[PDB]
Design a protein around this ligand. Structure first.
Ligand SMILES: *C/C=C(C)/C=C/C=C(C)/C=C/C1=C(C)CCCC1(C)C
Ligand SMILES: CCCCCCCCCCCCCCCC
Ligand SMILES: CCCCCCCCCCCCCCCC
Ligand SMILES: CCCCCCCCCCCCCCCC
Ligand SMILES: CCCCCCCCCCCCCCCC
Ligand SMILES: CCCCCCCCCCCCCCCC
Ligand SMILES: CCCCCCCCC
Ligand SMILES: CCCCCCCCC
Ligand SMILES: CCCCCCCCC
Ligand SMILES: CCCCCCCCC
Ligand SMILES: CCCCCCCCC
Ligand SMILES: [Ca+2]
Ligand SMILES: [Cl-]
Ligand SMILES: [Cl-]
Ligand SMILES: [Cl-]
Ligand code: NA
Length: 241
């Protein structure tokens, strides 16, 4: 695989895991220090949700760096490395990111429950496909989890977009910027997953880990950078509970 064996344990992908760990930690501390001088009740809610997104990713990338949670999967006569921490990362951070967008749109708790429910179903069925032993099952779960992603993305571009436009041009501008970013970044995940080691095997584990790291830092540090610098987080919020 493309990369360099930093720890001397036969894993060239630790170079991209180490870089991702640094970028997540730097982004976590940057949002944390920037949020200490924040007294607005609503802005503190966004900082609380957003800081956790690279903070949890930092722990997952640190665990994947040291090899904690690494195991093998046999699909015929080939051996596939799977990092459990990667999916546990997405299981926690994707609901928080959707919560950030739901706070901007100010949608009801039933809307949020359907959103995070389908989002979690997308992640679990993605892990199930990564653990299956036949290629037919791996593509079948990938297709099911992709459909669930489309359902989540459709709700952001239709229901949550219309509700956000009623809250004024400032929130609508920030919500449109983030949603435009989410529609393209999140779509890149099943594309890489199906062309990487878990799918056709076109992309090795090295480049896939590097590309997954770039998507992760952009969907977390880049997403939070656009949100936390906008004036929309000062507007009134209503947490689902
Ligand atoms: C901060 C981390 C984020 C926003 C991760 C997002 C991950 C996805 C949208 C993954 C989607 C997948 C499919 C739709 C097909 C099955 C395989 C997955 C889990 C890679
Ligand atoms: C009160 C506003 C929210 C009402 C939501 C009702 C629509 C529920 C859609 C359920 C979609 C399930 C997808 C299952 C996997 C494709
Ligand atoms: C909503 C997800 C549906 C996925 C469509 C493809 C699944 C087809 C599975 C067929 C299994 C054939 C077994 C051959 C023996
Ligand atoms: C208005 C339609 C809303 C739902 C659209 C969901 C699918 C988004 C497709 C984005 C395709 C990105 C292609 C670039 C990936 C490298
Ligand atoms: C023999 C050691 C080779 C080291 C090669 C390093 C290449 C540069 C890596 C830069 C990190 C990727 C940028 C990702 C930014 C999201
Ligand atoms: C477009 C994505 C690039 C995000 C780069 C993240 C690493 C830099 C941390 C940002 C902290 C600013 C000080
Ligand atoms: C972007 C800096 C990468 C440093 C890697 C050092 C490998 C020895
Ligand atoms: C503990 C953090 C490990 C960072 C490794 C950086 C490699 C370039
Ligand atoms: C308020 C900082 C959030 C960082 C999350 C750390 C998670 C520890 C496992
Ligand atoms: C919650 C972060 C766990 C990091 C584990 C590092 C283990 C180093 C031996
Ligand atoms: C054989 C794999 C079938 C998976 C069906 C998921 C809906
Ligand atoms: Ca306020
Ligand atoms: Cl403030
Ligand atoms: Cl206040
Ligand atoms: Cl590779
Ligand atoms: Na290594």
């Amino acid at each position: 695989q493309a990369g360099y064996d930093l720890l001397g344990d036969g894993r060239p992908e630790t170079l991209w895991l180490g870089i991702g760990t640094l970028l997540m930690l730097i982004g976590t501390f940057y949002f944390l220090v920037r949020g200490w001088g924040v007294t607005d009740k609503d802005a503190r809610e966004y900082y609380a949700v957003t800081i956790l997104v690279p903070g949890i990713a930092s722990a997952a990338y640190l665990s994947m760096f040291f090899g904690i949670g690494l195991t093998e999967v046999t699909v015929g006569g080939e051996m596939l490395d799977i990092y459990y921490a990667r999916y546990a990362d997405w299981l926690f951070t994707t609901p928080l990111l959707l919560l950030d967008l739901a706070l901007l749109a100010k949608v009801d708790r039933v809307t949020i429950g359907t959103l995070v429910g389908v989002d979690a179903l997308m992640i679990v069925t993605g892990l199930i496909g990564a653990l299956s032993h036949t290629a037919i099952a791996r593509y079948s779960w990938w297709l099911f989890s992709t459909i669930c992603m489309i359902v989540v993305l459709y709700f952001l571009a239709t229901s949550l977009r219309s509700a956000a436009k009623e809250r004024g041009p400032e929130v609508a501008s920030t919500f449109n910027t983030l949603t435009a970013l989410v529609l393209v970044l999140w779509t890149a995940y099943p594309i890489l997953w199906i062309i990487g080691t878990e799918g056709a095997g076109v992309v090795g584990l090295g480049i896939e880990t590097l590309l997954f790291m770039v998507l992760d830092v952009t969907a977390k540090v880049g997403f939070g950078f656009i949100l936390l610098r906008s004036r929309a987080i000062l507007g009134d919020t209503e947490a689902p509970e």
